[PDB]
Design an enzyme around this catalytic site. Structure first.
Site, mmCIF file in Angstrom:
data_model
loop_
_atom_site.group_PDB
_atom_site.id
_atom_site.type_symbol
_atom_site.label_atom_id
_atom_site.label_comp_id
_atom_site.label_asym_id
_atom_site.label_seq_id
_atom_site.Cartn_x
_atom_site.Cartn_y
_atom_site.Cartn_z
ATOM 1 N N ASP A 157 0.799 -1.213 0.000
ATOM 2 C CA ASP A 157 0.000 0.000 0.000
ATOM 3 C C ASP A 157 0.841 1.278 0.000
ATOM 4 O O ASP A 157 0.374 2.307 -0.494
ATOM 5 C CB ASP A 157 -1.018 0.009 1.169
ATOM 6 C CG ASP A 157 -0.423 -0.383 2.531
ATOM 7 O OD1 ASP A 157 0.811 -0.529 2.669
ATOM 8 O OD2 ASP A 157 -1.236 -0.516 3.496
ATOM 9 N N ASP B 80 4.165 1.114 13.314
ATOM 10 C CA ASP B 80 3.482 -0.193 13.426
ATOM 11 C C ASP B 80 4.186 -1.303 14.193
ATOM 12 O O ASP B 80 3.507 -2.089 14.860
ATOM 13 C CB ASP B 80 3.139 -0.736 12.041
ATOM 14 C CG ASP B 80 2.173 0.155 11.286
ATOM 15 O OD1 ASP B 80 1.299 0.797 11.915
ATOM 16 O OD2 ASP B 80 2.292 0.198 10.055
#
Ligand SMILES: [Ca+2]
Ligand SMILES: [Ca+2]
Length: 724
Positions: A34, A444
Site C-alpha cells: 500500500d 506499526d
C-alpha cells in the site's frame, strides 16, 4: 565512491494487500503493497525483489500500488495501478505503469484522476485486469465516481467505459471531512471468464465488482459493450473478490459488510453458476455466527472444486482460514475450539526466521503468539503447486509448501515467506558512537536495536511495546543511555534504557499525552526533554520518574539536545528557534525567520557545542538548509542548497577537518541524497535514479564509526543503508 544500497534487514513489517501468481508460467509471482511499491518473487532465493525504487521524491504517490496484473498470455508483461491518496494528501494523479521485462523497467500512462493505494478498500481486487485471450485489452476499476476505465492498446492509453452503469456509492467513514475515509470506493475488482474468448479475440464474458451493497456485481456477455447487474445476487454486502473456477463454471464472491482492510463485522460467501444463473449460499458459517467479513479468495487451478477463503477481519482470537474441496458445499478451518478456551490447529507456525512476529506477547489460550494472522485480504494457492499457498497480513507474508496435508488430516507447516520485502515507515534513526550500529524508530512495529544490519533483530522494543516510535535519542557521552517516545492506545508513551537499547523500563508521563512527539537526551544521560502530542514541553532529571513543565517554549515544538553541553537543549516551532541552558527548564526565543510552514529537521553536531544544522520548509514557502554556530542565536542559509528536508552526520573523511554531513535535499536542480566532506562548501550525490524511494524526508544519519555510511529513512521501503 560509487555507493551500494541495502536494507537494514527486518523482513516485512507492513501490509501486503495482494499477491499475484501468473497463470501460465510456473514460479512467476508478484506482491503489491500500500505504501512501498511492488515486488517480484525470486524462487531460487525464496525472496522478493523490489521493482519501484526508481519512483522519485516528486512522484512519491506512485509508491502506493492499488492493483497489479501479470499477463497470462505473455508473462513478460506486468502492469501496476499506482497512486496513494485521492484527497489533498497525495498531490499527483494516478497512473498505470507497464513493463515488458517483468518489472525491470517501466513506462507510465498517467490518468486524469487519483488512485487510492493507501486508502480504505485497498485490499479488494484485483481491479486492474488483462484480457486472457486478447492481451491488448485491459480494464481498471476507478474510485471517487470515475467508474470503469479501459485500454485497447496494451495500457498505453485509457478512457472511461461510459456504458458501465454504476460507479459505486460506498464509503467507509462518510463523516470524515479530511477526504481519507469518505471517498466512494468505486469499482473494486475485474475478472474475466477466459472460456468466452479465444486467441486474439476479445473475451466476451467479464465480471465486475462494485462498491455498492445493493449492486455489488455486474457482468458483460458481449465483450464489454453492455453491462447488467447479475439477477439474484446477494445484497447488503461488498464483494471483496470474485474468483471463477473455470472447470466447474462457478463464480465465487467473498462478501463483507465493509470495504476493509481493517474493519468487517459480517460476511458471506456466495456462488454463481455461470451456465444456469443459479446463486447458492456457500458460506463456511451461518450469517448469525459470522462476526467478520470474508476475503482471501483463491481457487486451486489444478484441482477443480477446491478453494479457500479467509475471515480477513477476524481480530480475536486470530484470523481464520477456510478450505473446501467440494465447491463450497462443505468446509474445514485452520483451527477450531476443542472446548473453549482450548484450541486445535491444522498447522504449525514457525517464525524463527522473523522472530519479532511473536510481538513479545504471552497470551492465554485461545490466543497464540505468534498469531496465524490479521488483515488477511490476500490469500493465493499456487496455480502450479497445490501444496503451496501464500497469504498476506498487516505485518508479513506467510506461506506453506505442504498444504495438501490439510486434506489428509495431517498438519502443514507455515513460515514467513517475506524475505526481501522491506515495507516499514521510518520516523527516526540514530547511530551511536559505541554499542549497536543502529537504533530505529518505526511505524506499526515499534523499531529495533540493530546489532547486525544483515540480520533480523530478535524483537522490537518492549517495556513498553509501543505501536510506533516517533522519536528516540541517546546520551552522546554515555550511549548506553537511550530514550524513546511513541504512540500507543495506553500510557506509557515513553521508555528508557541504560544498556544501549537492549532492555527497557517505562517512564512516567505528564497527563494528557496522546502521542509520542519528540524527545531529547542530555549529553551526560542525566536528564531529558520531552515534547509530546497532547501536552506541552516537559523536562526531567533522572529517568522520567517525574516531569516538570518547561517555560518559554510552545507546545508541540521539535526538541533536540546539544551533543556536548549536557545542560543545553533546543526547540523549533513555526519559524522560531528556542534554546535552553538549564537542562530544559526554561527556554528563550532565539533566531526567527526560519521556515514558518512545513516540516523541519535539525541536529546538533557531535563534538561541538552550539553547532546546529537545520533542514526544512516546503514547496510553497521558505525551503533550504541552515546552519548556526552560536547555539541558535543566528542561522545562515546555504547558498548551495535549494531545498533540504533531513540532515545528519557521520565520521569525518580521512584528512577532513569536519564531520561528514548527509542530507535528503534538492541541490542544483536534482533531488537526491547528498554528502559533504567540507562542512557544506560542496556536495556530492550518493544515491542514483534507480534508488530514490519516494519520500525520504523523515530522518537521516551518518555513522560515527564508519566513514561514508549513511542511514536513510523511507516511507514504505524500510531503512536504506548506503555504503561506499
Ligand atoms: Ca464516522
Ligand atoms: Ca532523535
Amino acid at each position: 565512491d560509487t555507493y551500494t544500497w541495502k536494507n537494514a534487514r527486518i523482513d516485512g513489517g507492513g501490509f501486503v494487500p495482494g499477491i499475484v501468481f501468473n497463470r501460465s508460467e510456473k514460479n512467476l509471482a508478484y506482491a503489491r503493497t500500500d505504501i512501498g511499491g511492488a515486488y517480484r518473487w525470486d524462487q531460487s532465493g525464496k525472496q522478493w525483489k523490489p521493482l519501484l525504487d526508481w519512483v522519485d521524491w516528486d512522484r512519491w504517490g506512485w509508491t502506493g500500488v492499488v492493483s497489479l496484473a501479470s499477463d497470462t498470455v505473455d508473462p513478460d508483461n506486468v502492469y501496476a495501478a499506482v497512486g496513494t491518496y485521492t484527497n489533498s494528501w497525495d498531490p499527483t494523479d494516478g497512473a498505470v505503469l507497464r513493463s515488458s521485462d517483468r518489472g525491470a523497467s517501466w513506462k507510465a500512462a498517467t490518468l486524469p484522476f487519483k488512485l487510492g493505494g493507501n486508502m480504505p478498500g485497498r485490499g479488494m481486487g484485483e481491479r486492474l485486469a488483462v484480457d486472457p485471450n486478447k492481451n491488448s485489452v485491459l480494464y481498471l476499476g476507478a474510485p471517487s465516481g470515475n467508474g470503469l476505465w479501459r485500454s485497447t492498446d496494451a495500457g498505453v492509453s485509457w478512457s472511461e467505459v461510459t456504458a458501465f452503469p454504476n460507479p459505486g456509492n460506498y464509503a467507509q467513514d462518510p463523516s470524515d471531512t479530511s477526504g481519507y475515509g469518505n471517498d466512494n470506493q468505486g469499482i473494486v475488482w475485474v475478472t474475466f471468464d477466459e472460456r468466452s474468448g479465444s486467441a486474439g479475440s476479445a473475451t466476451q464474458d467479464i465480471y465486475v465488482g462494485v462498491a455498492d451493497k445493493e449492486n455489488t456485481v455486474y457482468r458483460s456477455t458481449d465483450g464489454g459493450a453492455t453491462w447488467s447487474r447479475i439477477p439474484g445476487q446477494p445484497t447488503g454486502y461488498l464483494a471483496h473478490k470474485g474468483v471463477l473456477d473455470s472447470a466447474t463454471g462457478h463464480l465465487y464472491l467473498t462478501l463483507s459488510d465493509t470495504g476493509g482492510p481493517y474493519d468487517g463485522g459480517k460476511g458471506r460467501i456466495w456462488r454463481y453458476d455461470t451456465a444456469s444463473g443459479a446463486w447458492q449460499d456457500v458460506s463456511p458459517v451461518a450469517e448469525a455466527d459470522a462476526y467478520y467479513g470474508f476475503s482471501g479468495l483463491s481457487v486451486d487451478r489444478q484441482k477443480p472444486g477446491t478453494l479457500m477463503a479467509t475471515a480477513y477481519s477476524s481480530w480475536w482470537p486470530d484470523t481464520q482460514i477456510f478450505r473446501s474441496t467440494d465447491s463450497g458445499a462443505t468446509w474445514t478451518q485452520a483451527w477450531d475450539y476443542t472446548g473453549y478456551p482450548n484450541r486445535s490447529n491444522r498447522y504449525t507456525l514457525d517464525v524463527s526466521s522473523v522472530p519479532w512476529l511473536s510481538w513479545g506477547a504471552s497470551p492465554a489460550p485461545p490466543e497464540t503468539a505468534p498469531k496465524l494472522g490479521w488483515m488477511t485480504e490476500a490469500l493465493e494457492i499456487d496455480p502450479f503447486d497445490s501444496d503451496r499457498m501464500m497469504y498476506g497480513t498487516g505485518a508479513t507474508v506467510y506461506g506453506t509448501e505442504d498444504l495438501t496435508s490439510w486434506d489428509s488430516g495431517g498438519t502443514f507447516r507455515i513460515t514467513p515467506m517475506v524475505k526481501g520485502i522491506e515495507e516499514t515507515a521510518v520516523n527516526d534513526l540514530a547511530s551511536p558512537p559505541s554499542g549497536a550500529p543502529l537504533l530505529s524508530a518505526l511505524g506499526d512495529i515499534g523499531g529495533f536495536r540493530h546489532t547486525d544490519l544483515d540480520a533480523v533483530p530478535d524483537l522490537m522494543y518492549t517495556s513498553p511495546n509501543l505501536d510506533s516510535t516517533t522519536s528516540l535519542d541517546f546520551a552522546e557521552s554515555s550511549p548506553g543511555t537511550v530514550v524513546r517516545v511513541g504512540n500507543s492506545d495506553a500510557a506509557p508513551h515513553i521508555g528508557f534504557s541504560t544498556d544501549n537499547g537492549a532492555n527497557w523500563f517505562q517512564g512516567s508521563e505528564p497527563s494528557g499525552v496522546t502521542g509520542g512527539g519528540t524527545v531529547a537526551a542530555a549529553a551526560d544521560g542525566s536528564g531529558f526533554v520531552w515534547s509530546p502530542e497532547g501536552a506541552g514541553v516537559h523536562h526531567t532529571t533522572g529517568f522520567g520518574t517525574s516531569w516538570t513543565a518547561s517555560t518559554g517554549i510552545p507546545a508541540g515544538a521539535t526538541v533536540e539536545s546539544d551533543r556536548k553541553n549536557p545542560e543545553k537543549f533546543y526547540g523549533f516551532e513555526a519559524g522560531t528557534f528556542y534554546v535552553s541552558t538549564d537542562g530544559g527548564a526554561t527556554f528563550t526565543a532565539e533566531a526567527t525567520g526560519l521556515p514558518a510552514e512545513g516540516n523541519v529537521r535539525f541536529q546538533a553536531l557531535p563534538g561541538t557545542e552550539g553547532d546546529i544544522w537545520l533542514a526544512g520548509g516546503s514547496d510553497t514557502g521558505a525551503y533550504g538548509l541552515w546552519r548556526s554556530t552560536d547555539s541558535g542565536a543566528t542561522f545562515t542559509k546555504s547558498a548551495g542548497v535549494e531545498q533540504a528536508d533531513s540532515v545528519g552526520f557521520g565520521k569525518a573523511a580521512p584528512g577532513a577537518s569536519y564531520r561528514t554531513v548527509f542530507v535528503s535535499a534538492k541541490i542544483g536542480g536534482v533531488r537526491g541524497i547528498f554528502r559533504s566532506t567540507d562542512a557544506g562548501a560542496s556536495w556530492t550525490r550518493i544515491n542514483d535514479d534507480a534508488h530514490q524511494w519516494g519520500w525520504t524526508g523523515a530522518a537521516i544519519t551518518g555513522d560515527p564509526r564508519v566513514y561514508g555510511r549513511v542511514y536513510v529513512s523511507t516511507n514504505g521501503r524500510g531503512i536504506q543503508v548506503g555504503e561506499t
